[model samples]
Every structure is written in C-alpha cells, then in structure tokens.
Target: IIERLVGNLRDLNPLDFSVDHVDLEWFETRKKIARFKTRQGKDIAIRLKDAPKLGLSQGDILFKEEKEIIAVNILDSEVIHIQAKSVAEVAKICYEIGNRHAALYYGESQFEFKTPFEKPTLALLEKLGVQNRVLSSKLDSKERLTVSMPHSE
Candidate 1:
C-alpha cells in the first residue's frame, strides 16, 4: 500500500495540531523512498515528488487531516560509539571522526556518530585503537540541514 507524504509536521503551527507517530530507523530517515507498514496496520509507500533532504526526520509528518496529523518518530539506529578512559582520547577520536564529515554527539568519555551497521567508519575507528563499540541509539545530530530554525521568507 502507498500514501502520499506531506511535509514535516514541524512546519505547522503547534497550537491546534494533534499528531500520531510512525517508527523508522536512522537509515530509514535518510531515504527518499519509504517501504513499511504503519502501526495502524496499513502498508505505506512514501515516494516523494523530488529529491529530499533526509525527509523522514524524527518528527517528520506523514499525513494530515484537519487537526489530526500522522508523523514519523525515527527509531534508534546503530552507530559507532567511542568510549574511553580519558577526555583527551575522546577529543582526539572526535577529531578523527570529523575527517569523514560524520554526524556526531561527543561528551567527556563517549562519542557517538551515526552510521549504518558495520560501516567503513567502524573499521577506520578500529585501526585508531580508541576502544569502540557498536550500539543502537537515536541520532540527534546538531547539524541542522536548514539554515534557520524556522524558514523566513
């Protein structure tokens, strides 16, 4: 089954809008095409008209009808996690991870960068000897594709 994809729910005013959520993985979020069944037991195929920019984000809207809106709640994804005994080690790993222009979330002893399962970046990290593991988690990359929070026209 297929359904037309409306724009992200975030673009709408939150005051009168009520939303329902759909679950998808991190790699699913980056895709322009969607193939899945909704929680409501409806098979859905989301084919956007044109090329999209990570169209299916965490809060992306799938469909809407007046006050009722269907949205996407991107599920947790597998990523390479770097855990270390020293802050310096993490910082250095962050630097190396940046070389590939990866999306990241780094803290004192842990650094997370989103990627598909068993990606090349993992092997690259393995070579660095930074003590890493692969885990499934959400990607809240601070790197926003849109220049502004809300588009200004």
Candidate 2:
C-alpha cells in the first residue's frame, strides 16, 4: 500500500529499476486520486497532491522500492491533426479548438497542431476549410499548450 509517489523519472532515473507502468489516457493523468492497475496487473490506489500539476507524463514514477519502480504510460488516443496553410489559418484553428476547451498540442513538425478528436470538431474543421485527419498519437503532456481546463467544481 504505497501512499505517495517518489518523483518523476523525467528529471532523473536509474536503469536497474524494473518498471511496471500504469496505462493512462492523456486526460486521466490530471486526476489527483485514482485506482489503477499496473502492467503486471497489480492494483494500486493513488492519492497524489504533489504530482505534476499539468498532469503526469510517460515516465512519472509513482512508486519505488529497492529494484522496482511503478511508472505512468500514456496511451495513444485519437486526435485531429491539423496542418494550417497560413498564419491566419493557424490562428483560426487554435482559436476554434481552444473555444471548445479541447486540449491542444504541438505536432511533430512545424505549422502543425493536434487536438483530441470529436465528431462535431471534425465537422467544424471541414466547414472552416482547414486540413485535418484523425489519427492515433501519444500526446506528451510536456508538449501541451496552456489552456484552462473546462469548468470544474
């Protein structure tokens, strides 16, 4: 029964530790309290008040003991990949996605951006005349753009 996380492996690490990761959706990383199962099928209860504020990443170390480490593994999700033709299009695309309160992220290359896919959003892109395609890609929390989370209570 681990009560707290040691730290993220992003800033530091050691190879000797055998890592068993918990697969999490990009959005689920924001949860402060959760029950997750590791890749090895071990149930875990996590209540993190001091974890990464933006959310956990692919290598967040949730538990550590001698030669074992429990880490976070972000799952690939369907996203709308956009390649804007002009600066104006870029602005419009970003604005529209942000307006819907979708999490936005920089793509693997320049002049590109990505947001989680939704049917309405795809239709909006078509109506707006922007180029987009739905694909599965791992969205790194580190590459996420600054946006307020949709209303929370």
Candidate 3:
C-alpha cells in the first residue's frame, strides 16, 4: 500500500512537485511510524494507516495557526504527522517547517523582527498555491496545523 501511494504520488504533479526518492523502513519495537533522516536529510514518511480526520490530505501542506507564535519542529521533517488547530495555523506551521527543512520553495508568510507574525505571507502561500481570500484570517490563536477536507485544487 505504501509503495502504491508513493508511486501514485510520483505520477501526479502535486503542487507542481516531484520527490527525489521514497524509501520505507520498519521498526520492530516502537509501534510508531516515523521517517528517518536520510543522507540528504529529507524526512519522508508514508501513511501506513488512515490518520484521524485532524483535517488533512496527502499533498496538502500544513502550518501552525497562531497570531504571534512561530511553530518550530527541530525534529520531524514530514508535515503529514504535524498537527494544527486551524487552517491558518496549519499554514503557519507549514511555513516554519519548510523554512527549517530548506524546502520552503516560495510563497511564505513574512515575519517582522519584533512584531507579531499575523499575516501569512503572500509569497509563501502563493508558492503553495494557497488562495489568500479563501484562507481565514480570524485569529483564534490556537496551536497545531493540518489540511482538512474539501481540498483546494
């Protein structure tokens, strides 16, 4: 199943993207599924089982939803497992994750040195193909970010 999904992913132009490679490794003792850091330092993982409807899709990028705080994950490269409270939060999380991994291709929310990071930068969101108007700007100030249903084309 994992192989099939990876193959399917390779076939599509997801957000106009392509992966260098996809490898799977299994652990015996830890019942948890995780992506190990590779030589190139890409943290890739496939969904072994259906994840809870924390509102995310296979290709959808996620971000942490907050007004001031910036989400940071020194560990874990795959955005699939990261959680977010809202879509905006998920967008924030995605931006941070991409910046950390140097996978931040473009269209990211900009952050000032001292001011609170409120708006999701157009460049980053545009790179991710996120429609700014459709995105909610309401500041619930929550944590975690995940893609939800009704995925944008």
Mind giving the per-residue lDDT tens digits that candidate 1 earns over 9-110?
Answer: 557557377666777755456555657677676566766665454345666667776887667887776766656657677677566655555555542333
Q: Considering every candidate listed, which one attains the maximal lDDT? A: 2
Cα lDDT tens digits, model 3, 1-153, are: 121122223233442333333222111112225444333555544344443333122222211122211111122122222222356765674555445432221122432111112234434545664333322221111122332222342
Order of candidates by TM-score, top first? Answer: 2, 1, 3
* Candidate 1 lDDT: 0.59
Ten contiguous residues with the weakest lDDT in model 3: 68-77
TM-score per candidate: 0.53, 0.83, 0.19
Screening candidate 1 with a backbone cut-off below 3 angstroms (N, C-alpha, C), the clashing residue pairs are none
lDDT of each: 0.59, 0.82, 0.29
lDDT of candidate 3 vs native? 0.29
Which candidate's TM-score is highest? Answer: 2
